[PDB]
Amino acid sequence: GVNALPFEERYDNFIGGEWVAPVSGRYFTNTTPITGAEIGQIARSEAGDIELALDAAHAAKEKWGATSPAERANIMLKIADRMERNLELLATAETWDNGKPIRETMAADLPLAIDHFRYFAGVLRAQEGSISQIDDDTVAYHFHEPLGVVGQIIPWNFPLLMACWKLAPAIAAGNCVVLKPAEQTPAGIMVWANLIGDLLPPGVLNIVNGFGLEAGKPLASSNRIAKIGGKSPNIFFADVAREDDDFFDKALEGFTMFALNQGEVCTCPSRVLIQESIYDKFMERAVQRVQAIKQGDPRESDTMIGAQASSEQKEKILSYLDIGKKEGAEVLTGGKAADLGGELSGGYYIEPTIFRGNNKMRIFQEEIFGPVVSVTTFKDQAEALEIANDTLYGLGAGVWSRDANTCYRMGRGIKAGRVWTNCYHAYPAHAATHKMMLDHYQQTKNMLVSYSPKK
Amino acid sequence: GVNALPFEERYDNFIGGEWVAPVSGRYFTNTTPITGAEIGQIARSEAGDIELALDAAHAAKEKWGATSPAERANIMLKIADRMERNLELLATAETWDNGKPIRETMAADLPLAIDHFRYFAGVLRAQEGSISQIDDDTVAYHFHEPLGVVGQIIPWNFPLLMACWKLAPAIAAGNCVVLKPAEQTPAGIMVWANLIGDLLPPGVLNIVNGFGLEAGKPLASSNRIAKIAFTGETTTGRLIMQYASENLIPVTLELGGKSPNIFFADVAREDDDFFDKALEGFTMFALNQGEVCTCPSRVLIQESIYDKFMERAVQRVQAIKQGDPRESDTMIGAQASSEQKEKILSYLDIGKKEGAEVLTGGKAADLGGELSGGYYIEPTIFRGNNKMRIFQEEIFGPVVSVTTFKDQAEALEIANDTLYGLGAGVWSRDANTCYRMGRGIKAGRVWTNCYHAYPAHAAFGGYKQSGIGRETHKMMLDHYQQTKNMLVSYSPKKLGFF
Amino acid sequence: RGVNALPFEERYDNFIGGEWVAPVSGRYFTNTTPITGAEIGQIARSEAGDIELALDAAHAAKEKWGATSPAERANIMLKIADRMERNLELLATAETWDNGKPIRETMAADLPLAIDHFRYFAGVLRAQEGSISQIDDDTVAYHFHEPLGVVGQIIPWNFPLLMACWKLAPAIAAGNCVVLKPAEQTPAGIMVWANLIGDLLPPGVLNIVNGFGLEAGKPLASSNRIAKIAFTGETTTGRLIMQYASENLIPVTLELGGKSPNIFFADVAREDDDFFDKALEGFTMFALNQGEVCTCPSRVLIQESIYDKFMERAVQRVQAIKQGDPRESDTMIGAQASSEQKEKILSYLDIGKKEGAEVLTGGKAADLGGELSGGYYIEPTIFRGNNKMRIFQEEIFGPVVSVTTFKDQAEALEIANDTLYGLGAGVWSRDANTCYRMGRGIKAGRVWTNCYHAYPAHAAFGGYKQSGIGRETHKMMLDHYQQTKNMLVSYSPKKLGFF
Amino acid sequence: GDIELALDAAHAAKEKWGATSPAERANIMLKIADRMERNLADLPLAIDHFRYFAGVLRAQEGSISQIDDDTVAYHFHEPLGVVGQPLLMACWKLAPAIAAGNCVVLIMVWANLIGDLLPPGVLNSPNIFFADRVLIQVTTFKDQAEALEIAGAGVWSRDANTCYRMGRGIKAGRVWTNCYTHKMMLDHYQQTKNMLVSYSPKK
Ligand SMILES: [K+]
Ligand SMILES: [K+]
């Protein structure tokens, strides 16, 4: 179950379908953020193991992009189906490795990963090139070709959801991938590879591992492979507070979205704009809700918030929290670390903190990667747009309102890229993740053909 | 000169780039419905000129379909430029022959027609076949080809819009057209063909006039046409489908509709410009005398705002100005034919005696002077429940019926209670109500906080006993085309079994 | 369990609403295997009342299943395809037994194509997105894809399960509940497939009602409770169905049989290399499915001055076709789907003989000895005439191919196009310009170049002159089972100005 | 300074130009093409790309991805803003950007007539020959694979299985067969606004 260490020991690299040990023998320890207890040994590749990975990729490159789109899609579907029935194992691996809740892994990370695999198996079937009939004699054909080899550097935020988000398009398009998982949370990708890797031709899924300055730098700077987070407003208008029936409950539940996956999300809703005419009641219920979050051991059944990522995560979060506390950031809840006791002392927990202030303060124009939300207020829709667009960012935004004109005008006026409306943190496939990712890992072949013996 | 006559007294049959007198020698008189007078003689044709049109079309189809799509778009752009330079002549012709306000032809009709000829000349430039890689050895290439020769039966109520709603898709797609204008309004298409006759190559556009049993059936039952497009009455549509079910011919239709217009009490929340817009959108039944396929003639108003909405909407209806449609200012115009008055007056009688209390209007609109022989009915508002014939039969009159509901579920119930599925309008400020009403209404098109907008890029259609297809969109370019699927194999090695 | 053991059982009732319900009356007709004409079970005879039960269940599931998210329905379709792929042998044996098709042909092409078709349409469902149009700053039009509701389909018997899947995948991908009428020649294969997978779909999403094409085909087509009727079959029944479904305003989608040319240019035999073997393969492909293919290449057009070599080698390789028990893996051609069809091809052979066309091979029935005597086996027949004889202008659906010659490309186009059908065609040549010119010229919905009988999902397929309406096996089958909902939304509270 | 005031004008116009309907910008482009015809293989393609990109702008839709019964993702096609670039190239660039709703910053004589139509501030390889770099079967080669490993491109032949193989096997982006601009330009000067809207009141 979740309480048994999923990890095996001594994970080495995975190049060409076989577990290849480091060229220069080295193994850095796997420190689980949940407790800070060493849980495995991970290969430390420097510059040669990445070249073995590139060798396996360039050796399986020609036969994989030659595969049919239907056979490639069927391989992806088998990958997804074997990922499904092993849901608990991969979820437990990601929880142990990253400290995310076990509730948040069998509900939002794995099912999203499997659905991404199935989805990009489905977009490759429907994919088409294009014919342009220039005239009666000349025709232009546009085919989609794979890029070749692509190297992916997985972050530590979702080490399995984001890894699959970056793999599935690249494997659907027919490319061989060289992966370097981030050393903060390695070896959940090792577990996933040990689960699936034989389903792909040897050299399609290569996963080196090590340090960002050690392993990634030769990879990210390579003349072989063709290709290689801000403050998100959560505006609440006075509309949401007409009645206390079901949309205001949803509004509050969507306010407490900094505390899902410990705010390391790049689109963290860490800036909440509440209408002045509703601020008092909304913050009443919001403070009753944030303090109702159950912090504890991430891997039990129901811990809503777990360990962050590392020691550096805690130092950054604590530094930004203190800097906020200085300039006047009235704390409604939280505001420090959390020593939960038991085995949970070497961990890296931060408790959910509701800040309070104005967009001048540096907690609003600087991102924490932690469960720290910076509430503020605004007067009207125009001021809401003036404030919500005050940032050097825009990776996302969230608008809550019961008015059609308000929602559309906010969504179209906000300079974000993904505006949520009366929801937040829903990351479904086919919504831009979108079927246009397959074109990221594809080049185009243009053949212009003239069917006329004379000119 | 809008008040000056725009029609020659001898409109023959346009066939093969030239003016051809009918073989039967007969003719029929054209009546302007503004006054009831006579405005010219237009050729009466039968199954003999239908075949002349088909012969010209088939003699031009091979040369037309082989022209580049960039050559069939420059010609369309030149057609639109000519139609825009002469917007008043066409507006005046559509006014004299159809008897609708000159403002509605210089504002809606002609700009919409020019916009369609530009739009479908745009959609044609960006069109592209698909190439579906199957493996390294097999590739399927899909090409778009013209259907050949298409036959079109346009209706009267939009003489130059429904004619350009369907020529532009058909001429963009490389087909040659045999167009049959409705006998009730056969002159506007004639002036239009006069002014842009020489832009198209001979035989591509062939226009023949006549009645619906002598020049309509021969065109809509021929084996020389690839597709028959019809727009109008449902029974005539069944006639067309039966006639074209012998050569297995596509029969794209558009058959009326009884469109509701719902108000959810979110409009009466500030008495602001939005309430003003809702009031204006209520009276939209009077647009084109209510002889539009998407007529709001059913109105659903939330039970809490019925009193206020009526006490202002009756005022705005009583402010609708009627008169001679040919100067600058008439809002509600004249009916197309005398039989149109006859049907509408019979329907008004049925509504009066059924139990639909008359909020306003309810009789003819004798305007005196040189308008007594005209065809004018006063804009009318009744009030009943949905189980009454005025709610459940189309009128094409300046008539609307009003009933109320309790809540959104009842709104969907009543809005779907009819047998037609063409259109509907929704008026609310709440997003969830607007979406659930737009998606729950079993109609091909739903207007939310607007109505009677016909942009060239929004697919117009209905899915009930109201037709098959989608106008005003790039999907309609494919309705006049067919797919050639060339599945090439490149491996020169046998599969291994006979 | 085995290919040579019976794969059916007796009393296949109607599969209505995730159930097995008997007809309104105990009317039960009898299925009969073409391989050895004999009973292989007793099939329910469906009157109009069973169509009414099927439509009721389809409407209930239309209410519910309609709003099932595209990702859930695609998951159900993927699970259906996986279940079929893990039972490919059982389904293929059922198809061989009920249709007389060789087990070779089923296990090789027919069941893999059905599984690939379900996977393909689950995919194109996941990848399907509607449309938006920014009319101006204040008005947007939203084009939603919606289910049609309940659709009805009448499947032929030449490809019972393959056409059942070809029609079912887009229909249930699009959220449409289906009432499905199997051809009474081959009723019991769809039953086996249904009892296989009749637990992955919600009750009512798939309803299959088996009966005679006049007792049950008409009540299904003559119903206002279906948003569409789909048909594949003979042009007489196609015109009938067009009549019944035009009296109700419901759109129709036909796919009628065509007399498909198969042109062989004098370049196929230049170097008599493996490409020439492929061309002879393609010529012999007239006997695939025992000629019962709506796109059968039963009209071969060989260039005049290559005729000698091609016909000597091709008659050799057609005599080499091994006729035997279709349940043997070595058998290359099976039985005819019914005795009436065997009589039809025999009559057309006699017409061709009486019309002055020589017979190069075959020409009669065949008694394959043993229990196969009762079966309906026509010997692969080659005729030889010109384009004007009846057998060149009329459709046979038998292992019968008629051969003529052309002089140049223009005569090739004239002979290829001189017909009343445009369903399919085939063009064998090595010249690059010839293949494209001949594929563009030929009035055929599908044109195979340098191959033939390739039906890969995601390639469009339809009748081009008079042999049907619409396209199949492509992602735009989804649009044939969906309607567009336009929602024009104005975000400006400013009045229009007029009125 | 001069470029700075060009940028300031471009932003001031960008406030309003992006509000213009696709129909109206396409119509302005058609008027530009007409006016260029009046004052007319370089100008033909310039006019032709103005018409073509007006057409693609009229055709462009945007997606309405349906995630659930109660959740829809809308993919609008917002303009970027201000962008910066003989006359044929000038047009290949301006025609798409102006189509997308962008106030460009930059021919002179052409700019004199085109400028007034726009609102102010908006405008401111081997050559293989297969026997039936010049790779004649100038240099030479032996067989198909020979000229494949030697080697957008260009391929004269007639075998219909070497034209395809040699068109697909070349590591380039454009192969011309028996001889010797795209909607994807309009999506390069144009950004996507994804609006995920949830229509469920419950949670
Ligand atoms: K008239
Ligand atoms: K049978």
Short mmCIF file of C-alpha atoms in Angstrom, two decimals, chain A residues 157-433:
data_model
loop_
_atom_site.label_atom_id
_atom_site.label_comp_id
_atom_site.label_asym_id
_atom_site.label_seq_id
_atom_site.Cartn_x
_atom_site.Cartn_y
_atom_site.Cartn_z
CA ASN A 157 6.05 20.07 -9.53
CA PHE A 158 4.21 17.10 -11.04
CA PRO A 159 7.06 14.66 -11.76
CA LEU A 160 4.65 12.19 -13.38
CA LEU A 161 1.78 14.32 -14.69
CA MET A 162 4.12 16.80 -16.38
CA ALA A 163 6.45 14.05 -17.59
CA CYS A 164 3.53 12.41 -19.38
CA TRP A 165 2.25 15.79 -20.59
CA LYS A 166 5.62 16.24 -22.29
CA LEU A 167 6.05 12.63 -23.46
CA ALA A 168 2.70 11.70 -24.98
CA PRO A 169 2.77 14.40 -27.71
CA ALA A 170 6.41 13.62 -28.46
CA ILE A 171 5.86 9.86 -28.73
CA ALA A 172 2.59 10.23 -30.67
CA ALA A 173 4.42 12.32 -33.25
CA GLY A 174 6.98 9.53 -33.56
CA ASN A 175 10.00 10.91 -31.71
CA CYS A 176 12.51 9.30 -29.39
CA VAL A 177 12.81 11.09 -26.05
CA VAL A 178 15.72 11.64 -23.67
CA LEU A 179 14.41 12.48 -20.21
CA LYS A 180 16.21 14.13 -17.32
CA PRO A 181 13.92 14.23 -14.27
CA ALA A 182 14.73 17.01 -11.83
CA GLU A 183 16.85 15.78 -8.93
CA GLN A 184 14.40 17.20 -6.38
CA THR A 185 11.91 14.41 -7.14
CA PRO A 186 13.56 11.73 -9.28
CA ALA A 187 12.82 8.08 -9.73
CA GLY A 188 9.05 8.22 -9.83
CA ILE A 189 9.79 8.37 -13.54
CA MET A 190 12.12 5.44 -12.85
CA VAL A 191 9.17 3.52 -11.41
CA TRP A 192 7.03 4.46 -14.39
CA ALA A 193 9.75 3.34 -16.82
CA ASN A 194 10.17 0.06 -14.97
CA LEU A 195 6.42 -0.34 -15.46
CA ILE A 196 6.10 0.47 -19.17
CA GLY A 197 9.42 0.86 -21.00
CA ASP A 198 9.43 -2.42 -22.91
CA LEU A 199 6.23 -1.41 -24.73
CA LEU A 200 8.33 0.98 -26.78
CA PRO A 201 11.12 0.06 -29.21
CA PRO A 202 14.48 0.05 -27.42
CA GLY A 203 15.76 3.61 -27.55
CA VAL A 204 12.41 5.40 -27.71
CA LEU A 205 12.16 6.26 -23.99
CA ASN A 206 15.59 7.10 -22.54
CA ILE A 207 15.66 8.45 -18.99
CA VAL A 208 19.05 9.68 -17.76
CA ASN A 209 19.20 11.13 -14.27
CA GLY A 210 21.43 13.37 -12.18
CA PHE A 211 21.82 17.09 -11.50
CA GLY A 212 20.66 20.09 -13.48
CA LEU A 213 24.15 21.54 -13.82
CA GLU A 214 25.60 18.02 -14.21
CA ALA A 215 23.25 16.01 -16.46
CA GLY A 216 20.92 18.56 -18.04
CA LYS A 217 23.45 21.13 -19.24
CA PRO A 218 25.09 18.78 -21.80
CA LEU A 219 21.59 17.65 -22.81
CA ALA A 220 19.85 21.03 -23.08
CA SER A 221 22.91 22.35 -24.92
CA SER A 222 23.29 19.67 -27.59
CA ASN A 223 23.67 20.09 -31.35
CA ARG A 224 22.01 16.66 -31.80
CA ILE A 225 18.48 17.03 -30.40
CA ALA A 226 16.45 19.34 -32.63
CA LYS A 227 14.31 20.76 -29.81
CA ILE A 228 14.32 21.06 -26.03
CA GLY A 229 5.10 30.60 -13.37
CA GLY A 230 3.77 33.88 -12.00
CA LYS A 231 0.90 35.32 -9.98
CA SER A 232 -2.60 34.26 -11.02
CA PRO A 233 -5.53 36.44 -9.92
CA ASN A 234 -8.71 34.87 -8.57
CA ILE A 235 -11.10 37.82 -8.88
CA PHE A 236 -14.36 37.56 -6.94
CA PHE A 237 -17.10 39.99 -7.98
CA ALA A 238 -20.05 40.99 -5.83
CA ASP A 239 -22.18 38.76 -8.06
CA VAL A 240 -20.97 35.56 -6.39
CA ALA A 241 -22.51 36.57 -3.05
CA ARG A 242 -26.20 36.91 -3.96
CA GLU A 243 -27.15 33.73 -2.10
CA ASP A 244 -25.58 31.07 0.13
CA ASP A 245 -26.72 28.06 -1.88
CA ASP A 246 -24.19 26.33 -4.14
CA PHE A 247 -22.19 28.83 -6.18
CA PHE A 248 -20.88 30.67 -3.13
CA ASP A 249 -19.73 27.37 -1.63
CA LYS A 250 -17.99 26.68 -4.94
CA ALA A 251 -16.54 30.19 -4.88
CA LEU A 252 -15.00 29.66 -1.44
CA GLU A 253 -13.79 26.18 -2.39
CA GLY A 254 -12.13 27.76 -5.43
CA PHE A 255 -10.59 30.45 -3.25
CA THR A 256 -8.74 27.76 -1.27
CA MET A 257 -6.80 26.70 -4.35
CA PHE A 258 -3.37 27.89 -3.27
CA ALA A 259 -3.46 24.94 -0.83
CA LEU A 260 -3.94 22.24 -3.48
CA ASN A 261 -0.59 20.64 -4.37
CA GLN A 262 1.08 23.10 -1.97
CA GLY A 263 1.00 26.05 -4.36
CA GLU A 264 4.03 24.96 -6.36
CA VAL A 265 1.78 25.06 -9.44
CA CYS A 266 3.03 27.57 -11.99
CA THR A 267 -0.55 28.89 -12.33
CA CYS A 268 -1.04 29.19 -8.58
CA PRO A 269 -4.10 31.35 -7.66
CA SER A 270 -2.01 33.23 -5.10
CA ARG A 271 -3.68 36.63 -5.55
CA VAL A 272 -7.36 36.94 -4.58
CA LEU A 273 -9.35 40.07 -5.49
CA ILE A 274 -12.62 40.26 -3.54
CA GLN A 275 -15.29 42.89 -4.14
CA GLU A 276 -15.51 45.50 -1.39
CA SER A 277 -19.28 44.98 -1.13
CA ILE A 278 -18.74 41.28 -0.27
CA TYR A 279 -15.29 41.23 1.33
CA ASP A 280 -16.40 40.83 4.95
CA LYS A 281 -18.65 37.78 4.53
CA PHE A 282 -16.47 36.16 1.89
CA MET A 283 -13.40 36.44 4.11
CA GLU A 284 -15.38 35.16 7.09
CA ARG A 285 -16.18 31.95 5.22
CA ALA A 286 -12.76 31.87 3.52
CA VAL A 287 -10.87 31.96 6.82
CA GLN A 288 -13.22 29.32 8.21
CA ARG A 289 -12.33 27.25 5.14
CA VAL A 290 -8.53 27.61 5.00
CA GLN A 291 -8.14 26.69 8.67
CA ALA A 292 -10.38 23.69 7.91
CA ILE A 293 -7.61 22.25 5.70
CA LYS A 294 -6.17 19.09 7.29
CA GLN A 295 -2.38 19.23 7.10
CA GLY A 296 -0.55 16.04 7.98
CA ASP A 297 1.16 13.02 6.49
CA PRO A 298 0.60 13.30 2.71
CA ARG A 299 0.27 9.55 2.21
CA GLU A 300 -2.61 8.53 4.45
CA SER A 301 -6.01 8.95 2.83
CA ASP A 302 -7.15 12.51 3.26
CA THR A 303 -4.30 14.93 4.03
CA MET A 304 -5.26 18.00 2.01
CA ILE A 305 -1.72 19.43 1.95
CA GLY A 306 1.71 17.82 2.25
CA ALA A 307 5.46 18.44 2.30
CA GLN A 308 6.69 20.98 -0.15
CA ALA A 309 9.62 19.80 -2.27
CA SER A 310 12.91 20.14 -0.41
CA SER A 311 14.96 22.27 1.98
CA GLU A 312 15.40 25.02 -0.62
CA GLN A 313 11.63 25.15 -1.02
CA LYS A 314 11.18 25.83 2.68
CA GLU A 315 13.95 28.43 2.79
CA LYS A 316 12.42 30.37 -0.11
CA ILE A 317 8.87 30.11 1.25
CA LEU A 318 9.93 31.15 4.75
CA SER A 319 12.03 34.05 3.44
CA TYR A 320 9.18 35.42 1.33
CA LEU A 321 6.74 34.87 4.20
CA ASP A 322 8.92 36.86 6.61
CA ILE A 323 9.44 39.63 4.06
CA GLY A 324 5.67 39.80 3.73
CA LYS A 325 5.16 39.88 7.49
CA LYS A 326 7.52 42.86 7.80
CA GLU A 327 5.88 45.34 5.41
CA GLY A 328 2.43 44.67 6.90
CA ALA A 329 0.59 41.66 5.55
CA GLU A 330 -2.00 41.01 8.23
CA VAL A 331 -2.04 37.26 8.75
CA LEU A 332 -5.51 35.77 9.03
CA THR A 333 -4.15 32.23 9.38
CA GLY A 334 -0.88 30.35 9.18
CA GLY A 335 2.36 32.25 8.71
CA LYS A 336 5.21 29.84 9.53
CA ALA A 337 6.32 26.23 9.17
CA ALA A 338 4.39 23.35 10.76
CA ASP A 339 5.99 20.71 12.98
CA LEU A 340 3.43 17.91 12.80
CA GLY A 341 5.24 15.49 15.12
CA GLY A 342 5.58 11.74 15.02
CA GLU A 343 7.82 10.69 12.15
CA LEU A 344 7.00 14.05 10.55
CA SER A 345 9.77 16.33 11.74
CA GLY A 346 12.44 16.12 9.05
CA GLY A 347 9.84 17.02 6.44
CA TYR A 348 9.35 20.38 4.74
CA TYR A 349 5.80 21.45 5.56
CA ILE A 350 4.55 25.04 5.33
CA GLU A 351 1.18 25.78 6.72
CA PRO A 352 -1.44 27.52 4.54
CA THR A 353 -1.12 31.27 5.05
CA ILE A 354 -3.74 33.87 4.14
CA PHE A 355 -1.93 37.17 3.69
CA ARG A 356 -3.67 40.54 3.32
CA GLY A 357 -2.69 43.81 1.67
CA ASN A 358 -2.47 45.65 -1.63
CA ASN A 359 -0.84 45.07 -5.00
CA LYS A 360 1.91 47.55 -4.13
CA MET A 361 3.38 45.12 -1.60
CA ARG A 362 6.12 42.82 -2.82
CA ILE A 363 4.19 39.66 -1.89
CA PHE A 364 1.87 40.48 -4.80
CA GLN A 365 4.55 40.96 -7.49
CA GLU A 366 6.73 38.06 -6.31
CA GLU A 367 5.83 34.37 -6.40
CA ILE A 368 6.35 32.07 -3.43
CA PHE A 369 5.65 28.53 -4.69
CA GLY A 370 3.87 27.89 -1.42
CA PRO A 371 0.47 27.82 0.25
CA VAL A 372 0.49 31.61 0.69
CA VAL A 373 -2.40 33.65 -0.74
CA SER A 374 -2.41 37.46 -0.91
CA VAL A 375 -5.97 38.76 -0.55
CA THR A 376 -6.85 42.30 -1.66
CA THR A 377 -9.90 44.34 -2.71
CA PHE A 378 -11.18 46.34 -5.67
CA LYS A 379 -14.04 48.72 -6.35
CA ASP A 380 -15.57 47.89 -9.76
CA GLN A 381 -14.95 45.81 -12.88
CA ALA A 382 -12.61 48.39 -14.39
CA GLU A 383 -10.51 48.49 -11.22
CA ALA A 384 -10.53 44.69 -11.09
CA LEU A 385 -9.08 44.65 -14.60
CA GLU A 386 -6.59 47.39 -13.71
CA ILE A 387 -5.29 45.40 -10.73
CA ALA A 388 -5.47 41.88 -12.19
CA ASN A 389 -3.31 43.08 -15.10
CA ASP A 390 -0.74 44.63 -12.72
CA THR A 391 2.00 41.98 -12.83
CA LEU A 392 4.99 40.84 -14.89
CA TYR A 393 3.12 37.59 -15.44
CA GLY A 394 -0.16 36.24 -16.76
CA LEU A 395 0.24 32.48 -16.91
CA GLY A 396 -3.36 32.26 -15.69
CA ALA A 397 -6.31 34.01 -14.12
CA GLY A 398 -9.62 33.20 -12.50
CA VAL A 399 -12.92 35.09 -12.64
CA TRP A 400 -15.95 34.33 -10.47
CA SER A 401 -19.24 36.05 -11.30
CA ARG A 402 -22.90 35.29 -11.94
CA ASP A 403 -23.14 37.72 -14.87
CA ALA A 404 -22.61 36.83 -18.53
CA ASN A 405 -21.21 40.20 -19.60
CA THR A 406 -18.90 40.35 -16.59
CA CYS A 407 -17.39 36.92 -17.21
CA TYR A 408 -16.80 37.42 -20.93
CA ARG A 409 -15.43 40.95 -20.57
CA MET A 410 -13.10 39.88 -17.76
CA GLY A 411 -11.87 36.81 -19.62
CA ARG A 412 -11.26 38.77 -22.81
CA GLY A 413 -9.74 41.77 -21.03
CA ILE A 414 -7.43 39.97 -18.62
CA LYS A 415 -4.03 39.57 -20.25
CA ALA A 416 -3.61 36.01 -18.98
CA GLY A 417 -3.50 33.04 -21.32
CA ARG A 418 -5.88 30.62 -19.61
CA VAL A 419 -8.78 32.33 -17.86
CA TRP A 420 -10.93 30.14 -15.65
CA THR A 421 -14.55 31.16 -15.11
CA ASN A 422 -16.59 29.91 -12.13
CA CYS A 423 -14.00 27.16 -11.61
CA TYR A 424 -10.28 26.88 -11.18
CA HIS A 425 -7.45 24.37 -11.55
CA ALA A 426 -9.39 22.20 -13.99
CA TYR A 427 -6.67 20.98 -16.38
CA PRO A 428 -8.45 18.69 -18.83
CA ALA A 429 -7.06 17.39 -22.08
CA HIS A 430 -8.05 18.99 -25.42
CA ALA A 431 -8.27 22.38 -23.65
CA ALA A 432 -5.21 24.60 -24.14
CA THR A 433 -2.83 19.73 -23.17
#
